[PDB]
Amino acid sequence: TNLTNSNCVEEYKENGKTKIRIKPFNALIELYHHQTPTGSIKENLDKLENYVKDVVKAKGLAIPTSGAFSNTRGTWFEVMIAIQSWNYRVKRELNDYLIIKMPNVKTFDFRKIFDNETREKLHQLEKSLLTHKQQVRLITSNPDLLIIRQKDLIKSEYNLPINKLTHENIDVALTLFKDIEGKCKWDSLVAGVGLKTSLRPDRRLQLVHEGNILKSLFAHLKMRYWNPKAEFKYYGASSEPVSKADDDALQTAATHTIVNVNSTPERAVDDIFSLTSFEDIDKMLDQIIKK
Amino acid sequence: NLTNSNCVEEYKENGKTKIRIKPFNALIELYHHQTPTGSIKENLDKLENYVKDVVKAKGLAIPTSGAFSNTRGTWFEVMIAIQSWNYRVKRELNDYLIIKMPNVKTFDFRKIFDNETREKLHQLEKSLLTHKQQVRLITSNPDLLIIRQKDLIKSEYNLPINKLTHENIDVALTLFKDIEGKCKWDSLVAGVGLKTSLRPDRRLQLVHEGNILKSLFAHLKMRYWNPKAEFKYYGASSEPVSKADDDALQTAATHTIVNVNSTPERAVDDIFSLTSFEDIDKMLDQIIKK
Amino acid sequence: TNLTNSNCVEEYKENGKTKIRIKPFNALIELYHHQTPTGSIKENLDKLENYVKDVVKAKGLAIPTSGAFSNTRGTWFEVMIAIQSWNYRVKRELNDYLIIKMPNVKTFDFRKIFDNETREKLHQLEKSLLTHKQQVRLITSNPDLLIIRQKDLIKSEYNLPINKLTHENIDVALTLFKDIEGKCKWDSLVAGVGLKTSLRPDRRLQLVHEGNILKSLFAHLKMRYWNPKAEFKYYGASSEPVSKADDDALQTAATHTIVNVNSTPERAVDDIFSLTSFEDIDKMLDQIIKK
Amino acid sequence: NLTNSNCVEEYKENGKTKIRIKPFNALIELYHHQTPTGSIKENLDKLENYVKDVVKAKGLAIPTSGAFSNTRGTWFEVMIAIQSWNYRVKRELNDYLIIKMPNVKTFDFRKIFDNETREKLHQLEKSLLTHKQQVRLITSNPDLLIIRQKDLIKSEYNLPINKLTHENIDVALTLFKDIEGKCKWDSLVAGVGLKTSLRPDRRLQLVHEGNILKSLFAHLKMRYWNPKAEFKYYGASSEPVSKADDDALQTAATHTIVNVNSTPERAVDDIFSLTSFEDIDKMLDQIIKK
Ligand SMILES: [Cl-]
Ligand SMILES: [Cl-]
Ligand SMILES: [Cl-]
Ligand SMILES: [Cl-]
Ligand SMILES: [Cl-]
Ligand SMILES: [Cl-]
Ligand SMILES: [Cl-]
Ligand SMILES: [Cl-]
Ligand SMILES: [Cl-]
Ligand SMILES: [Cl-]
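YS: structure for the whole thing
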C-alpha cells in the first residue's frame, strides 16, 4: 500500500544532476509503527533493504548502488543495537547501568564522557608522549557499545521502553552519550564492545587492537588513581557465527599484561559473541553485566 | 614462448577450473641474467603485465585483481629479500643477517631462539594458558628480521645473488632454516613489516605486529634483567607515505604506557617509502646504524 | 665575666624539689653576640658545654647529667646546621632554594609541606593499604634537612644573613617549615639529609631505612603524576669521619628499585658526608644542590 | 666445680686481660640430660646467673651488662634453633627444614641457592655494581630460614636432640652447610628474625631485613615469571609485644608501593612474643600452615 509514497528515499540535485539518497530512519519508522525489530537481525535488515528496493521501483528511480545499501544496513544495525540495549536495561531493571551506542571517534570521542579530573590525566599523558625528540602519540578509538555503571547518571526518561520506532526515540537512543558528557567517573565504565559484520581477518584484527588500546589506557588510569580493583573488559560481537579458529585467535593476550609478573593475565578481547537474533543481544549483555 | 611460461597455472579445485599465479616462476623467467633494479613499481608492473600477457597467450582465465594484489606483495617481499641479501654483501656487514621470514603457519617466530630463551617463553606461554580463562601468546613473523650474531654467518652468505634462479631464490627464502634454534634473544636488532600500501588493514597489521614483537622482547628484557637490549620494529610501503598515515603510525606501544619507568615508544619506530631498490639500501642503512 | 649571671641554666621546682634545666638557646646567644659559629663543630659544641659547666659551678648548682648535656649538644648542633644552611643559600645566591631544618615527625610531619593535591594522593594510598584483612601501614619519618626548590616560596627576609645569634633569628631558622606548609609542589623537593652523630650500626641503619622509605614514597608519587623526570635524592651526614666499611655499606640498593628492570639502579642513600667543620656543611650542600 | 666451668674465659687482647663469655659451654654445662623447657626468660636468667656465679668463683672480672645482653641473644637464638630441630621431628614435617643461619660474615644468604638462581642474582649484582655510581646488593641472614624441599632431608635430621652437647649443638648450627648451593629459589617458605626485645634498633633490624629479603624474592619472582611463589618474613621477641611496636611493625614493604598490581604487604608479616618453648611451637605452627 502506497510506496510511490514512501519517504525511505529522497531525490536531490547536485550540480544540476538529480541524485537519490536513502533515508534509513524513515525506513525504520515506516516499517516499525507498532513494534520493535524481533527475531532474525539479518532478516529484519533484508526486509528493510527490500522495502527500500520496492519503493525505488514503484517510484521509477535510479537504483542505489550496493554501497549505498551496505552503508544503510549498518545504520539500521546501529539503531537495532541501540534500541535493544535501551529496552534491555529497562526489562532487566538495571537502574544503575547505561548501555550506550557510540558513534565513531571523530563524531564524538568517547573519552569526552569522562569527568575533568580523568581527562586532565589523559591529556597530561598525551603531552608527555608527544614531548620527545621522536614523537609518540596516544591514539584511541570508540568501542561501538559502552556499558557504564553510575547511578547518578540515570534519568527517569531512560526507564520508558521503546515499543515502536519514531524519529524521536531513535534520535534519543543515538545521542545518549551527550547526556553523560563529562560526567563519568573513570572507573564507572565496565565494558566496551566492538561490533563487527564478520570476523574477516581485518575485522578480527580491529577487535584485537582496539582491546589492547582501550585496556592499556584503563590500566594506565589504574596506576594514576592507584585503584587496583577497577576493572574494564572489552568484547567483540560478530554478525556471523564464530568459528573455533577465530575464537582461538581472539584469545591473544593483552600485550601490556606480559611485561609485569604482578599483572593478571588477560586477553585483549575478553570474549567474542555471535549476534544472530535480537535475543543474542540480550544474552551478550547478560554475560557482560554479570553472571 | 609465452604459451610456454610457468608463471601461471590452471588447477582443478573441486568442480571448476581455477587459475593460479606462480610468482617465483614469473621472477625466474623475467630475471635470468640480473636481479631487479630501478623502480620497484616498474618491476612490479612489468611482472604483472608479463603474467597477463602469458594468461592471454595461454588463453586462460584472468586472475582476479585481488589475486594480483596478493602476488604483487609476494614479489615486493621477495625482491626486498634479495636486495637485502646483496646489501649485506656489498656493505660487508659480516656480523649481520637480514632474513626473510615465511608466514606464521610456516615457521613460528620463537623457533629462532636458542634453548635458554625458548624455555623462558614456553614458561610464559604455559602460565598464560593455565588460568580459568585461557590467554594465549600469539606471535607473528615480521617480513624481515635483522640479527647480529657473528657465529651464525656462513661463508656462502657472502656470495651475491647476481641472477634470479629457483635456486638463488631458495637460499634466500630458506635462510631462516639455518638459524632456527640458534639465536640469542638479544641478537635481534629489528623486524620490518613490508606492505604494498598503507591501506587501513595493512597499516593496522604493522601497528599490531610492532606491539606483539616489542612486548615479547620487553618480557625477555625483564626475564634476563637486561635494560639495555634493544629491539626496533619498522614498516615499509611501496607507495608514498601520507602525512596522515605517518601520524597514525606514531601510536604508542601499549605495553609502554603502564609503567612510568618505561621509555615511551611507538609500536612502529619508523615507516619507509620504498620507491627504488636504492631506497631499500637507504632503509637498511638507517635500521642497522643511524 | 659574670657567670653567676648566666641564663644558660635555670632553676625550677617540681613537687617541691628544686631541679636544674639547661637553656641551650640562651647559651648560644650569650656566646654568639657578635659572630656565628666557625671552624670545628665539635670545638664549638665543647665550648658551649664547658661554658654551661662553668656557669653551673659559679652558681654552685647541682650538675646536669651527661644525658642532659648530650641532649643539649644535639639542640645546639641542630641550630648550627640550620644557621649555616640559612647563610649558605644567601652567600651562594640560591634565590630559588630553601634548605630547611626539620624537627621530628611527631612535632611536624614534613609531608605537611606538600600541597593539597599531593597530600590527598598519599592519604588515598594510606587508606588503600589500611583497607586489607591484614592491615599494612604507610609509616614515614622526617629527614633532618630538606632541600626545596620553588621560587615562589622565597621571601625577601630569607635573604638577610645571620651574623650573630639572637632568640629571634634562631626561632626563625627553626620554624621555617611553617612558612611553606601546604605550599610545596611534590616535585619541588630535591633532597633530604639524615644527620647522624656517628655511623654506629643503629645509626647507619636509620639512614638506610629512611632513604628507602622516602625514596619509595617519591617513586610512588612519580607514578601517580606520571612524571618520570622528577628526582629525589636522600643523603646521610655523619659527625665523625666516614670509614670505607661504612661507605661500602651505604651503597646498598634502594629495595624498590630491584623489582622492575626499567627503573634506574639507585642507592637507598645517594651519598654520605662527614661534617667536621662548618665549611664541610657548605661542601655537602654544594654537592647536593648541583655539581 | 664452679672454679672448673668453661662457660667463661680470660684472654689477653693487647695490653689488658679481658674476660669473655663462652655461651655454648654455658649451655652444655647447664643442659646435660635435657634440653631447655618452660619459660625462656627463666632459662636465660638461669644461664646468666650461672655465668655470674662462675665468674665470682673464678674471681675474675664481671662481663659488661652489654656483653650479657649479647650472650643472652645467642642463647635465645640457639635455644630456638634446638626447639625447631625437635619441632620438625615431633610434627613429622618430613619435607621441611628449619635452619639456623650464622651471621652474614660467616655465610652469605645467597649461597643457599642452587646454580640457576645464583647466576640470576650474580647477574643482578653485576649489573648494579656496573654504573657510574656503584649500587651494591647487600643481603642479611634471617636468624631462621624455613624451606620446603623433600630431596634435602637426611634421615639423621629425624633424630631428636634430647641433650645439649658440643655435638648436638654443632649439627644444629651447621645444618646450613648441608643445603648450601642446593635450594631451589621457590623452596623458601619464610625467614624469622629473633630479637631479645623490640628495642628501637632491633625493631628496625626486623623491618629492614624483611624489606631486604622480600624484595630479593620479588626480583626472583620476576626473573622466573612465577607470580605464585610466596616468601614471608617474621619477627619474634622474648618480651611481650606492645601495641605501639606492633603498629610500627605494620610498615609497608617499600618495593610494594610502586606498582599498583603489587599486592600490598608488610615488611614483617607478623610478630611473635615467645614466652615459653611452647610458644616457639605455636609460632612455627602458624608459619608453616595457618
Ligand atoms: Cl532518514
Ligand atoms: Cl581525554
Ligand atoms: Cl589520584
Ligand atoms: Cl611460483
Ligand atoms: Cl637469566
Ligand atoms: Cl633556652
Ligand atoms: Cl600526606
Ligand atoms: Cl596527576
Ligand atoms: Cl662457647
Ligand atoms: Cl627462567
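YS: worth flagging: The domain at 1-290 of chain B is CATH 3.40.91.10 (Restriction Endonuclease).
IM: good catch. Also The first helix of chain B runs from residue 23 to 30.
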